[PDB]
Amino acid sequence: ENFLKLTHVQRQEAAQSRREEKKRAEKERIMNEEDPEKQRRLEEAALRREQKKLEKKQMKMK
Amino acid sequence: VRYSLDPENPTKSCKSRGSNLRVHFKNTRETAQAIKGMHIRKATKYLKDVTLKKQCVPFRRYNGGVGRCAQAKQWGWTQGRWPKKSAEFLLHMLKNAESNAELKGLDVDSLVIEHIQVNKAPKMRRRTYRAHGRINPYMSSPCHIEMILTEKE
RNA sequence: GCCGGAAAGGGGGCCGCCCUCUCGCCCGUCACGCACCGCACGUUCGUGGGGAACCUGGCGCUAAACCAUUCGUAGACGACC
RNA sequence: UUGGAUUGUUCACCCACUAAUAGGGAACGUGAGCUGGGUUUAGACCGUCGUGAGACAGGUUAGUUUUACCCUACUGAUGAU
RNA sequence: CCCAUAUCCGCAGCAGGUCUCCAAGGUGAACAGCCUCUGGCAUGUUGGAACAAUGUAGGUAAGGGAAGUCGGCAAGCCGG
RNA sequence: AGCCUUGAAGCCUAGGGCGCGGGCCCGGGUGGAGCCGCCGCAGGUGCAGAUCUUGGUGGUAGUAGCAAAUAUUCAAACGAGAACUUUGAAGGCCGAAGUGGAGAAGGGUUCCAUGUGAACAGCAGUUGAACAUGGGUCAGUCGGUCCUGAGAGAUGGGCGAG
RNA sequence: GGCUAAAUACCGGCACGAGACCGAUAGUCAACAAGUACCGUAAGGGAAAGUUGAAAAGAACUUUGAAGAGAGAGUUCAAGAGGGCGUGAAACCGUUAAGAGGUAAACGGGUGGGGUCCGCGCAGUCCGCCCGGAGGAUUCAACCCGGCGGCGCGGUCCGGC
Numbered sequence: 001e002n003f004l005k006l007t008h009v010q011r012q013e014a015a016q017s018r019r020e021e022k023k024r025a026e027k028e029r030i031m032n033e034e035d036p037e038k039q040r041r042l043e044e045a046a047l048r049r050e051q052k053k054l055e056k057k058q059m060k061m062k
Numbered sequence: 063v064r065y066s067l068d069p070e071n072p073t074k075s076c077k078s079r080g081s082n083l084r085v086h087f088k089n090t091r092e093t094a095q096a097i098k099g100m101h102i103r104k105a106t107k108y109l110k111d112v113t114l115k116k117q118c119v120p121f122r123r124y125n126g127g128v129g130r131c132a133q134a135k136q137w138g139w140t141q142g143r144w145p146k147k148s149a150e151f152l153l154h155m156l157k158n159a160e161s162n163a164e165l166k167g168l169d170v171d172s173l174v175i176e177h178i179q180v181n182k183a184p185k186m187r188r189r190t191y192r193a194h195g196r197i198n199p200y201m202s203s204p205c206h207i208e209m210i211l212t213e214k215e
Numbered sequence: 216g217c218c219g220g221a222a223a224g225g226g227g228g229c230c231g232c233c234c235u236c237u238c239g240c241c242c243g244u245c246a247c248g249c250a251c252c253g254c255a256c257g258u259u260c261g262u263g264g265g266g267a268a269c270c271u272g273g274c275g276c277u278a279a280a281c282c283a284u285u286c287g288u289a290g291a292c293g294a295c296c
Numbered sequence: 297u298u299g300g301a302u303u304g305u306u307c308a309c310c311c312a313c314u315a316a317u318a319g320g321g322a323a324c325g326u327g328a329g330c331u332g333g334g335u336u337u338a339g340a341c342c343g344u345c346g347u348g349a350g351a352c353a354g355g356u357u358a359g360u361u362u363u364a365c366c367c368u369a370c371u372g373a374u375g376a377u
Numbered sequence: 378c379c380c381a382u383a384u385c386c387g388c389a390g391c392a393g394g395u396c397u398c399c400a401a402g403g404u405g406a407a408c409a410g411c412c413u414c415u416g417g418c419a420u421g422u423u424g425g426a427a428c429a430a431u432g433u434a435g436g437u438a439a440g441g442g443a444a445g446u447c448g449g450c451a452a453g454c455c456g457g
Numbered sequence: 458a459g460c461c462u463u464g465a466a467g468c469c470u471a472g473g474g475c476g477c478g479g480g481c482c483c484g485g486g487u488g489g490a491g492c493c494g495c496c497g498c499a500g501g502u503g504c505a506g507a508u509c510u511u512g513g514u515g516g517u518a519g520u521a522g523c524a525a526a527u528a529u530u531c532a533a534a535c536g537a538g539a540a541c542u543u544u545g546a547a548g549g550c551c552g553a554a555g556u557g558g559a560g561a562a563g564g565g566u567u568c569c570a571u572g573u574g575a576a577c578a579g580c581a582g583u584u585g586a587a588c589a590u591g592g593g594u595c596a597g598u599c600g601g602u603c604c605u606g607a608g609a610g611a612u613g614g615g616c617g618a619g
Numbered sequence: 620g621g622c623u624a625a626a627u628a629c630c631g632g633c634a635c636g637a638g639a640c641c642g643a644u645a646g647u648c649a650a651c652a653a654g655u656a657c658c659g660u661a662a663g664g665g666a667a668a669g670u671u672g673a674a675a676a677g678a679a680c681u682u683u684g685a686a687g688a689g690a691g692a693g694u695u696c697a698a699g700a701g702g703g704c705g706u707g708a709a710a711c712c713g714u715u716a717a718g719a720g721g722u723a724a725a726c727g728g729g730u731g732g733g734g735u736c737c738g739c740g741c742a743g744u745c746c747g748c749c750c751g752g753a754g755g756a757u758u759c760a761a762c763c764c765g766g767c768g769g770c771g772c773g774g775u776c777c778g779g780c
């Protein structure tokens with residue numbers, strides 16, 4: 001357990017990197033979506049998802 | 063938190079937990095004993111088949127009135143059911159344990175669900191209405207859950 | 216190798232040979248072996264029954280049951296065809 | 297070892313058929329099996345008794361018949377060794 | 378605002394109870410029953426699959442016609 | 458010149474024992490601040506029951522059940538999520554003594570809008586008469602107000618311990 | 620016909636002090652937003668409910684999931700104290716370990732089998748005397764000095780009380 005605590009920073013950094021890669025791939029797929037109506041629906045859902053995350057964060061902070 | 067069984071090796075073992083999960087405790091104890099030793103791909107596949115009624119859940123300890131099905135002759139039992147709310151609660155929890163073994167860098171395709179127990183949570187209380195002006199309890203039986211997976215190659 | 220055994224079937228008799236000793240049994244000669252110093256479950260059936268996993272080879276073996284589906288000679292559900 | 301008329305009847309009695317229309321038991325078998333005609337609450341009528349309230353194995357009429365999902369037994373249905 | 382099979386009283390979003398106003402077309406004697414228009418609703422605290430028994434509520438039964446039962450109870454006949 | 462933050466009470470204990478027993482002493486754990494031995498004193502002083510009292514929890518049991526009043530179906534939208542929300546198209550019911558449109562008594566914010574999905578709405582809900590925010594009831598002519606009805610009720614008087 | 624302080628009474632009121640009292644099912648019904656919530660048309664009836672920690676230092680931040688919920692991280696002596704949070708028993712339940720299983724279970728007497736720990740088992744007691752065997756003291760008896768104490772029919776010593 002002590003070793004895992006020592007290694008704790010590395011695991012968080014790796015987890016953050018894998019989320020950055022997943023987010024980058026999601027943006028690339030949205031960019032690559034040929035149909036403008038599909039692209040808009042995906043973009044609106046992504047933005048609303050972010051907004052829900054922001055509201056949830058603000059509620060937890062409150 | 064303080065679990066019941068501690069893993070034999072904390073690095074290659076992931077944990078999960080659930081408190082006041084509005085499921086049925088008897089159903090969750092049975093679909094947890096069905097999962098108790100499986101491999102995590104076997105489990106997610108089984109628990110999806112339970113929701114699609116391609117495999118069942120043998121009801122062994124709480125089997126009053128629990129009718130007989132044909133898909134229980136694989137467990138050498140006669141009675142069984144297809145708990146959907148209870149195959150989806152300890153599937154969102156098997157997903158949580160997956161996303162907790164990736165936070166530890168384990169091999170998700172090598173995880174065996176090693177320890178899994180279901181406890182009994184505080185009952186929530188409602189009331190029904192019966193004949194001759196009598197009111198009765200209509201209490202809910204929630205459960206606590208907690209699993210521990212482990213890399214076992 | 217041939218024989219005979221079925222009630223819940225005999226590792227028995229016999230044919231041979233190319234093997235090998237005159238020891239095996241009785242009565243004696245001849246000396247020896249831990250003679251562990253008075254002392255308990257010793258001495259067999261026992262290459263026991265079950266269970267694991269190991270080495271070492273020889274010959275060989277590559278299936279079904281259940282579920283899902285289907286049927287209706289069947290059926291509360293299972294079961295059954 | 298029966299079908300019916302009368303009676304709440306048990307009993308009894310008669311008609312008809314029949315081989316014969318024997319007797320009985322099982323908490324006077326059997327009300328979470330039924331019915332509720334009788335008996336046996338509260339309403340009322342008549343008779344006899346009592347000054348009276350009331351009484352009458354004396355008649356009359358109307359009168360709520362609850363629950364099994366438990367264990368066993370039994371009947372079927374899975375399965376177990 | 379509700380004024381009632383969810384805003385009231387019955388412990389409740391309870392088949393109960395609770396005072397009135399207005400009042401279309403057809404059939405028909407008719408404010409009866411049945412279909413419809415205006416207006417309203419989504420089957421009355423849930424759905425899916427089966428189609429066993431025993432129930433609950435409706436039906437129909439050859440021949441006989443109360444032999445059933447304490448008793449024609451129930452059902453049936455009749456019906457304008 | 459008792460024990461105690463170098464760990465008191467309490468509780469748990471396949472640990473060691475004592476006593477015929479009531480009971481007791483040690484060890485380990487948990488805990489975190491008070492406690493006991495003796496000689497006397499005092500008492501609201503020892504529980505298995507009382508159809509005991511209060512609280513908690515089981516088997517029954519994932520069982521009974523979620524069956525009065527004919528009935529739902531398709532596509533789309535919102536959404537993490539749709540048998541149940543919303544729109545549209547079908548099919549149906551109520552069938553002017555209505556499941557319509559308005560009022561009295563009663564309720565008291567149930568009204569309207571936006572949001573929420575914890576609890577509740579005996580399944581679910583993206584919905585609600587739920588929850589949280591805010592709004593909303595405008596009178597010389599509509600009623601009350603006024604008048605008497607059945608009746609209630611002062612003064613005078615009478616009665617009365619009051 | 621009339622008046623009249625003091626000694627005397629006081630489970631209401633204001634303000635006080637105390638206790639061989641109870642210690643949150645006790646003590647007032649009420650330690651707490653208690654004659655409150657609630658019930659009844661009314662007269663009336665009438666509860667349950669105290670405890671995180673020394674200090675909120677009340678868990679930033681990362682992560683899965685829509686969320687509740689978790690997994691990490693951090694605070695603290697301690698979250699094995701995490702907003703109904705001191706300690707956290709019993710019934711009841713879950714899981715892990717060990718054994719067992721057709722006369723319901725349980726039980727008393729007797730053993731045997733297995734476990735769990737303990738003995739901190741695994742070469743087994745010490746003690747007095749004496750004999751011998753090797754060593755080491757500043758050491759015994761007896762005398763002298765000083766102190767202390769006991770006893771003395773010091774037959775009947777001096778002086779006290």
Ligand SMILES: [Mg+2]
Pocket residue numbers: 122123124125126
């Ligand atoms: Mg059982």
Ligand SMILES: [Mg+2]
Pocket residue numbers: 127
């Ligand atoms: Mg049963």
Ligand SMILES: [Mg+2]
Pocket residue numbers: none
């Ligand atoms: Mg049943």
Ligand SMILES: [Mg+2]
Pocket residue numbers: 190191192193
């Ligand atoms: Mg009811």
Ligand SMILES: [Mg+2]
Pocket residue numbers: 194195387
């Ligand atoms: Mg009632």
Ligand SMILES: [Mg+2]
Pocket residue numbers: none
């Ligand atoms: Mg009898």
Ligand SMILES: [Mg+2]
Pocket residue numbers: none
């Ligand atoms: Mg009987």
Ligand SMILES: [Mg+2]
Pocket residue numbers: 327361
């Ligand atoms: Mg009866």
Ligand SMILES: [Mg+2]
Pocket residue numbers: none
């Ligand atoms: Mg009668």
Ligand SMILES: [Mg+2]
Pocket residue numbers: none
């Ligand atoms: Mg009478």
Ligand SMILES: [Mg+2]
Pocket residue numbers: 420
């Ligand atoms: Mg219907």
Ligand SMILES: [Mg+2]
Pocket residue numbers: 382421
């Ligand atoms: Mg309704």
Ligand SMILES: [Mg+2]
Pocket residue numbers: none
């Ligand atoms: Mg419906």
Ligand SMILES: [Mg+2]
Pocket residue numbers: 438
């Ligand atoms: Mg006929």
Ligand SMILES: [Mg+2]
Pocket residue numbers: 439
């Ligand atoms: Mg005919």
Ligand SMILES: [Mg+2]
Pocket residue numbers: none
């Ligand atoms: Mg007759």
